[PDB]
RNA sequence: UACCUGGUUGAUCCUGCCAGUAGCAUAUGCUUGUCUCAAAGAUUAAGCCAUGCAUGUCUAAGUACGCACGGCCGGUACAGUGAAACUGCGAAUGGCUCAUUAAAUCAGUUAUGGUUCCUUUGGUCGCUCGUACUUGGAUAACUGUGGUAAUUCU
RNA sequence: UGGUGACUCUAGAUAACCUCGGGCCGAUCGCACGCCGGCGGCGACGACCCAUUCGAACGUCUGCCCUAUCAACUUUCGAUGGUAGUCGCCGUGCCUACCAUGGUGACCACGGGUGACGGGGAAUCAGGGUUCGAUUCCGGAGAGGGAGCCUGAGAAACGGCUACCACAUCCAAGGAAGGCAGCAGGCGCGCAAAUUACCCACUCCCGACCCGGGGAGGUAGUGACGAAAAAUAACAAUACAGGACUCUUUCGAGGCCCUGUAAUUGGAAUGAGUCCACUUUAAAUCCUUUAACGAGGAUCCAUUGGAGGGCAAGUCUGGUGCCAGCAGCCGCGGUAAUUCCAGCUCCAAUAGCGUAUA
RNA sequence: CUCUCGGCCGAAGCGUUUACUUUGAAAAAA
RNA sequence: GAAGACGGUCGAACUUGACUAUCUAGAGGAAGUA
């Protein structure tokens, strides 16, 4: 190419958007924004493919252009605006609030939350620097910078934002015994307790996580998001509790849902 | 770049020996017992069993407690039991190797129409299906190679918009009534 | 009187100001029911007027019994004029597309790139 | 479905190939009722190309003294809709082809603590101790006079 | 102060400098209107720098087909390295100056070829393999051949410009214009490949933008490349010097069950068609749904190859007479041809089936 | 297989160095 | 602040050689091919 690309073919779109083959050649191609385009939901896919409020992209244009969608407390008229992990999508007209949280199969769930919960979110601090007359700074996982954080906040911690002010209320430290969600790789969407972290210098660290049923899995350090302190999550968790069932017991649950219902 | 899909697949395989007596005789017997159109209809059913047996030949080589053998070995048995080719009590993975062509050819809709007393030969049944006289629970089926499942078997009838069922009489009876 | 209307996947869309649903049509002996007859049938189910409801995309199944389409039922008529594709407004006579073709517009666009300011409007 | 069969001799057993056999791709021949999906100027010539089209774009929110149309009610800076033109952005994406190219391209893996980055998103934007209740000159559109056989010329 | 596995990092402190081809420190626009002449609420457009996003670009390690009738190559004119610079967005022989004489190779360097763009993948397949991948996804390259640039965040851009080379257009002979390996279309080339059609309704992209545009893309057309389903008849009653089944020693008797090469009899059932209407769609078509019509030699007619062997199926009949021809191979044909040319019958696959080549 | 601290165990070393084997995570969609 | 000029650089192309390759016009002939 002679410059940056603007299209996305539909087959090369991310798998967890769950687009299908035959409706078009192109995928929505997210705008640049706070989240990575392999790691986001564009607002057009959330609003007609997940919520079924629209049937075309033209109707998503009509819904968004009435200024009806607030993502993290601000109105977005962009239909390909990249919403991402733990963003609060709040539709005021229908009185719904949503948070984007991965399912146990690594896709964003349609997780409804109460408007008490819709005033905060958790972020993961990715960078700390001191800049220009000794003012300390944060950089979170969704491109927020915060001036003057608490000096105990370090890289890989998890802070809590109030969505109106933008300021930190409190935070969790990165330690063994805290609760996780995996935000990357094979183990994506799983939830458990930190038990170990082995440090390889010059390369990626590996964190071992233990499930609520005693299953254990590793990730890398960058695929780790500290949800809660100890065992209590600071947010509401989706339908499955981050416990990935095997295919045999998922089949057993799906068959037990048919011999009882009907 | 078009928004199409080019996935397709052949349903039959031609035999390696083109003129082999005692293959021709056996396949002609299988045609005559079931009223098939040509030899490709026989080779189509040889192809599905050869894939089912290849799928069970590889599960039988894995460890007896392996998760793939326990998971895909139980889905493969469930489908054969469901379409009536296996028995319920025969749900071990080794009885798949004791399945035959005629066990699948019994479960065509054409033979079920003949065997349920709706027709009076295996050739009256195909010609009954093809001109829209047979339904399965609500739905008129045109297809003679419709593999009937074991629960959708007693719901086979005469398709209420047909002269043999609900009965507006046909084009020929109507004209003969108009004539005299 | 032998036709029936059912509604499966109902949802009140507050954003586009409509109710939207899947319509099941049961015409066990006749042809496919016309779109105006389904709107008369649906408006007395949902206690409205047929000019505010818009049904489309019906496919009769093989065998001939059932038909499945989609419908939308708007709050007002002006909401229907605002939030609709214009090809469905044109199916009720509430919109008229201009009748020029597309090869005429492209050749007229290219003929007036050869011309500076106010003579562009004098291009035939 | 882990497969062979004809052919050297008067007859035999071999070596050994030739020929047969089945698929799959391009062409071609003869034939063709129904219906679903569907490749399609790659191979020779990255040869040559009539004609048409394929890239443009305005919101409440950069600039309206075109009566172009209407329109206040008529001192009423500018009601409004608005072609044109200036300004801004896009035209570096997409589409096509496979000529070149043999540690090159490319793939997996790593790195930028050795760089640049329109845009989006967040931060920053009285941190500087030294006519403003608003500054200056132009130029299009428009009006008018033209040149050239001829251009999206001027 | 803070950080990294590691800084010559970040932050701090001091002395200055700060490019006229100047660095930031707002002379910009809308809406709602106001509170006590001042103080104002939402936006929009901006803007140095920092971070983020989309990238890009340079590097790391391992991996490629044939060729020795290619055995030494590289170093003059940078080859390998050192020091200092120049240029670059930056690291670096990238370039320059001065030094050192290095660097690669039978573990195949260097050179040549490729009917070579690379992968994901495809066909075939006991297991191992062998061959293909121009081609819708990703990456690269190139817009006749080379070269040079402008603008810009991004281009050595070609539906931008400037030359040369090769072609080629208009001319009043002075001059002017060009680039289909985009969509169609034409010529050529060939064994070899479709419409100068409709639309932005879908999928998305761009713009100042809910509004405009899009031969991207969608929709039809041509389409036996190829893949899936699936008609060309079914039934009954007669008749058979049929057949088998129960009795009869056997004849011969049965509604006992099947068969037919019966243009035997019989009305029953249907689609192919013709064709209203709806539905479909941007508008249409197609399919699906339904009216009415639509079958007896149901002439509403199934073909392509074969019939000695390999290899399923006629040493039946006439013609030919080593001729004409057949035959992948062995062979057939010379007056009785199981093999040619035909009739009849039979075999195989069947809306498909031969031939050529990889 | 062990040494100092942090809470009898971890942080600090590995044990000569590899091949091998099993695991884990990382590996675009189609 | 335009034309223009000295110089430098990048550098298509042009001419003359040398080597090498191909397409074409080309007398003569030979052998095998039958």
Curated annotation (Swiss-Prot), chain A:
Major localization listed first in the record, in broad terms: cytoplasm
Give the range the annotation lists for the signal sequence.
none
Q: How does it assemble?
A: Component of the small ribosomal subunit. Part of the small subunit (SSU) processome, composed of more than 70 proteins and the RNA chaperone small nucleolar RNA (snoRNA) U3. Identified in a IGF2BP1-dependent mRNP granule complex containing untranslated mRNAs.
Q: Which GO terms describe its cellular component?
A: cytoplasmic ribonucleoprotein granule; cytosol; cytosolic ribosome; cytosolic small ribosomal subunit; extracellular exosome; focal adhesion; membrane; nucleolus
Glycyl lysine isopeptide (Lys-Gly) (interchain with G-Cter in SUMO2) cross-link, chain position(s):
229
Q: Where are the transmembrane segments?
A: none
Specify the protein name: Small ribosomal subunit protein eS4, X isoform
Q: Which GO terms describe its molecular function?
A: RNA binding; rRNA binding; structural constituent of ribosome
Subcellular localization(s) per the UniProt record: Cytoplasm; Nucleus, Nucleolus
All residue ranges annotated as the S4 RNA-binding domain in the record: 41-103
Q: Name one Pfam family in it.
A: Ribosomal_S4e
Q: Tell me the domain of life.
A: Eukaryota
Q: Which GO terms describe its biological process?
A: cytoplasmic translation; positive regulation of cell population proliferation; positive regulation of translation; ribosomal small subunit biogenesis; translation
Q: Which CDD domains does this one have? A: KOW_RPS4, S4
Q: Which UniProt keywords apply?
A: Acetylation, Cytoplasm, Isopeptide bond, Nucleus, Ribonucleoprotein, Ribosomal protein, RNA-binding, rRNA-binding, Ubl conjugation
Q: InterPro entries recorded for this chain? A: KOW (IPR005824), Rib_uL2_dom2 (IPR014722), Ribosomal_eS4 (IPR000876), Ribosomal_eS4_C (IPR032277), Ribosomal_eS4_central_region (IPR013845), Ribosomal_eS4_central_sf (IPR038237), Ribosomal_eS4_KOW (IPR041982), Ribosomal_eS4_N (IPR013843)
Curated annotation (Swiss-Prot), chain B:
Q: Which UniProt keywords apply?
A: Acetylation, Cytoplasm, Isopeptide bond, Nucleus, Phosphoprotein, Ribonucleoprotein, Ribosomal protein, RNA-binding, rRNA-binding, Ubl conjugation
Q: Where in the cell is it found?
A: Cytoplasm; Nucleus, Nucleolus
Q: Where is this cross-link: Glycyl lysine isopeptide (Lys-Gly) (interchain with G-Cter in SUMO2)?
A: 92, 138
Note the Gene3D superfamilies from the entry. Answer: RNA-binding S4 domain
Q: Which residues carry this modification: N6-acetyllysine?
A: 65, 115, 154
| Short name of one Pfam family | Ribosomal_S4
Query: Mutating residue 136 to F: effect?
Result: In a breast cancer sample; somatic mutation
A GO BP annotation: translation
Residue numbers of Phosphoserine PTMs: 152, 162
Which Gene Ontology CC terms are recorded? Answer: cytoplasm; cytosol; cytosolic ribosome; cytosolic small ribosomal subunit; extracellular exosome; focal adhesion; membrane; nucleolus
Q: Does the keyword Protease apply?
A: no
Q: Name one GO molecular function term.
A: RNA binding
For this chain, the annotated S-S bridges are none
* Annotated family: Belongs to the universal ribosomal protein uS4 family.
Role noted for this protein: Component of the small ribosomal subunit. The ribosome is a large ribonucleoprotein complex responsible for the synthesis of proteins in the cell. Part of the small subunit (SSU) processome, first precursor of the small eukaryotic ribosomal subunit. During the assembly of the SSU processome in the nucleolus, many ribosome biogenesis factors, an RNA chaperone and ribosomal proteins associate with the nascent pre-rRNA and work in concert to generate RNA folding, modifications, rearrangements and cleavage as well as targeted degradation of pre-ribosomal RNA by the RNA exosome.
This chain belongs to the protein called: Small ribosomal subunit protein uS4
In its UniProt entry, the species of origin is given as Homo sapiens (Human)
Q: Which gene encodes it?
A: RPS9
Swiss-Prot record, chain C:
Q: In which tissues is it expressed?
A: Mature tissues, such as adult brain, skeletal muscle, heart, and kidney, express low levels, whereas tissues and organs with significant populations of proliferating cells, such as fetal brain, placenta, bone marrow, and various glandular organs, contain significantly higher levels.
Q: What is its main location?
A: cytoplasm
Give positions of region: Disordered. 90-124
Q: Please give one Gene Ontology molecular function term for this protein.
A: structural constituent of ribosome
Q: Which GO terms describe its cellular component?
A: cytoplasm; cytosol; cytosolic ribosome; cytosolic small ribosomal subunit; endoplasmic reticulum; membrane; nucleolus; nucleoplasm
**Compositionally biased, Basic residues: which spans?**
99-117
User: Any one Gene Ontology biological process term?
Assistant: ribosomal small subunit biogenesis
Classification via PROSITE patterns: RIBOSOMAL_S24E
Coiled-coil region: none
Annotated Pfam families: Ribosomal_S24e
Q: Which sequence positions carry the modification called Phosphothreonine?
A: 7
Numbered residues of crosslink Glycyl lysine isopeptide (Lys-Gly) (interchain with G-Cter in SUMO2) = 35
What the entry lists under InterPro entries is as follows: eRP_eS24_sf (IPR053709), Ribosomal_eS24 (IPR001976), Ribosomal_eS24_CS (IPR018098), Ribosomal_uL23/eL15/eS24_sf (IPR012678)
Query: In which compartments does the protein localize?
Result: Cytoplasm; Nucleus, Nucleolus
Signal peptide extent: none
Q: Which Gene3D superfamilies does the annotation name?
A: 3.30.70.3370
The record's keywords, sorted A to Z, are:
Acetylation, Cytoplasm, Diamond-Blackfan anemia, Isopeptide bond, Nucleus, Phosphoprotein, Ribonucleoprotein, Ribosomal protein, Ubl conjugation
| Assembly behavior | Component of the small ribosomal subunit. Part of the small subunit (SSU) processome, composed of more than 70 proteins and the RNA chaperone small nucleolar RNA (snoRNA) U3.
Disease cited in the entry: Diamond-Blackfan anemia 3: A form of Diamond-Blackfan anemia, a congenital non-regenerative hypoplastic anemia that usually presents early in infancy. Diamond-Blackfan anemia is characterized by a moderate to severe macrocytic anemia, erythroblastopenia, and an increased risk of developing leukemia. 30 to 40% of Diamond-Blackfan anemia patients present with short stature and congenital anomalies, the most frequent being craniofacial (Pierre-Robin syndrome and cleft palate), thumb and urogenital anomalies.
Family (UniProt) = Belongs to the eukaryotic ribosomal protein eS24 family.
Instruction: Tell me what this protein is called.
Output: Small ribosomal subunit protein eS24
Protein species of origin: Homo sapiens (Human)
* Gene that encodes it: RPS24
